[PDB]
Amino acid sequence: ADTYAATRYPVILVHGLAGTDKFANVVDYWYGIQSDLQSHGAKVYVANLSGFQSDDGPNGRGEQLLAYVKQVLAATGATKVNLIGHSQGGLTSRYVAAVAPQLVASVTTIGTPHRGSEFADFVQDVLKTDPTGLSSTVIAAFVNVFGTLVSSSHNTDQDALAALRTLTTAQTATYNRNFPSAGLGAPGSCQTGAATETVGGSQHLLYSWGGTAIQPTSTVTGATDTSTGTLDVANVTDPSTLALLATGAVMINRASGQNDGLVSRCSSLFGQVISTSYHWNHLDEINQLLGVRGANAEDPVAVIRTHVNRLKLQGV
Amino acid sequence: MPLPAALPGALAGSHAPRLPLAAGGRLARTRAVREFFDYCLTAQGELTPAALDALVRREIAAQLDGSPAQAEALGVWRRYRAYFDALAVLGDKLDPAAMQLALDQRAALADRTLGEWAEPFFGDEQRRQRHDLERIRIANDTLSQKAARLAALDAQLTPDERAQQAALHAQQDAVTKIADLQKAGATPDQMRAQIAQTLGPEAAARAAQMQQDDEAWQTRYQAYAAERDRIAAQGLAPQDRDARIAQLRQQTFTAPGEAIRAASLDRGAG
Ligand SMILES: [Ca+2]
Structure with a gap:
């Protein structure tokens, strides 16, 4: 053990998706991440958000995270926290930074669709004629993989799809109006905002990164997975690999541009953008499934470890 | 450049x-x-x-x-x-x-x-x-x-990962003890008493203050809610009603972030 990632304030990892900090009620959502960071001197807590899928309103995930942050501070005596969220977890983190600015030192979002997901929009349209969405081979593939990851649920198929409702272009647009942030750029400019924000007298360091494994090819526009070689074992051991390529292809055909399977580069931009060059799909971002990633994918654990060191050097 | x-x-x-x-x-x-x-x-x-x-x-x-x-x-x-x-x-x-x-x-x-x-x-x-x-x-x-x-x-498991897991579990269990008391509806005094004999007096004082802050917030939000409802009852057009309520929120909650929080609570069952 060392102090490489020994930040001043505790780090709270904030999951997104269907619910809880677990995948299939067995493995950690943030696979091998909390243990790695702790070995490097960081005091790392993992939020476990269940119940309401939405980040907004009474008892929404934002209020749940707010309550958790206060419990962590009460237990530790720390006065602020560093929030690192994935997918919807980035939006949940923004909630806390907006309503309790004095309790937050930094907000980092990983693969967060701040401007919505084209796939979430696709699903929304498909469900207008088919509530199951199974009439779509891509949606069927998505549900098959993500449905098996849902924890503490007796109806994973439904929950896996419900998790997309908060990520539509329309829903996120409303969310951004309700929770403004200097970290967001001008709507439709595909540019990030400010690296820091002043809320009340509090100062927050804002960061983000995303994966762009799914790249468009020729032209219906084609798509390729740059995380894997011409032929990779990840397509066999990690079923989400091919599924995310398919969902990412649908996004590309909706003019999303390069993406991670669910979130486009443009939508992921927030605060100081560390990188959008990582050859990752949505799940590689959290070292899933079970640490399996394509041959061309950077180490997500090393990336997070590097960022917490970055946070430490910034004084938080 | x-x-x-x-x-x-x-x-x-x-x-x-x-x-x-x-x-x-x-x-x-x-x-x-x-x-x-x-x-x-x-x-x-x-x-x-x-x-x-x-x-x-x-x-x-x-x-x-x-x-x-x-x-x-x-x-x-x-x-x-x-x-x-x-x-x-x-x-x-x-x-x-x-x-x-x-x-x-x-x-x-x-x-x-x-x-x-x-x-x-x-x-x-x-x-x-x-x-x-x-x-x-x-x-x-x-x-x-x-x-x-x-x-x-x-x-x-190896003696390293087992120890690493026990440490992470203990770290979270302290947070869980506080969370459980909140779910039970513990008053600030009860929160302080119970936490003091498990996590220590320092954490107990912080947890008790946390409960007090939450209770004060709930009271202030509920008082605001009555005023919010009086505005909503005036029958103004949606846009005008929302603007008047937004103003009331801005005047009532001036601690940074609270006006935004009240807006969030207004969008649900609270
Ligand atoms: Ca993977």
Whole structure:
């Protein structure tokens, strides 16, 4: 053990998706991440958000995270926290930074669709004629993989799809109006905002990164997975690999541009953008499934470890 | 038109982790050696293979310039990159069988390419995955049985991961004790009393204040809610009503962030 990632304030990892900090009620959502960071001197807590899928309103995930942050501070005596969220977890983190600015030192979002997901929009349209969405081979593939990851649920198929409702272009647009942030750029400019924000007298360091494994090819526009070689074992051991390529292809055909399977580069931009060059799909971002990633994918654990060191050097 | 950072975005703002040195003035055969390389490698997507190689050589030199360790480090670098080179589908479900075999293959390459360094590089990683892959299989089976299979499986952990897990569990359990008292509706005095005899008086005072802050917030929000309802009852057009309520919120909640929070609570059942 060392102090490489020994930040001043505790780090709270904030999951997104269907619910809880677990995948299939067995493995950690943030696979091998909390243990790695702790070995490097960081005091790392993992939020476990269940119940309401939405980040907004009474008892929404934002209020749940707010309550958790206060419990962590009460237990530790720390006065602020560093929030690192994935997918919807980035939006949940923004909630806390907006309503309790004095309790937050930094907000980092990983693969967060701040401007919505084209796939979430696709699903929304498909469900207008088919509530199951199974009439779509891509949606069927998505549900098959993500449905098996849902924890503490007796109806994973439904929950896996419900998790997309908060990520539509329309829903996120409303969310951004309700929770403004200097970290967001001008709507439709595909540019990030400010690296820091002043809320009340509090100062927050804002960061983000995303994966762009799914790249468009020729032209219906084609798509390729740059995380894997011409032929990779990840397509066999990690079923989400091919599924995310398919969902990412649908996004590309909706003019999303390069993406991670669910979130486009443009939508992921927030605060100081560390990188959008990582050859990752949505799940590689959290070292899933079970640490399996394509041959061309950077180490997500090393990336997070590097960022917490970055946070430490910034004084938080 | 100067650059905002000297290093590629992936590394900018961070420092390289330290290369471990043993007594024999040589590189300590620990996973820390691998972490050094994976660090630089996080920038592989923004650099040409040549630029990447040049960076690693420079980073190694910065720490071990003019020493046996430097040559040793460059040696591992060669064997590591050989690993990635030697490292080089039906839309179905997941099977712990194939995933188990893949790890068996990757473990083979690590031995051929990294050899002596295969253990410190992927030792822990291999166990972590193999172990978890089992719990998943046991969970997904005819078994009734499962509990006994998992209880035994969880007896194959190393003294390091078991201790690491106990520490993380203790860390979270303190938070859970506070959360449980809130769910039980503990008054600030009850919260203080119970926490004082488990987490200590300092945490008890903080937890009690937290309860008091929550109770005061609830009272203030409820008082505001009555005023909000009086405005909503005036029958104004939606736009005008929302604007008047927004104004009331801004005047009532002036602590930074609270006006936004009240707006959130107004959008649900509260
Ligand atoms: Ca993966």
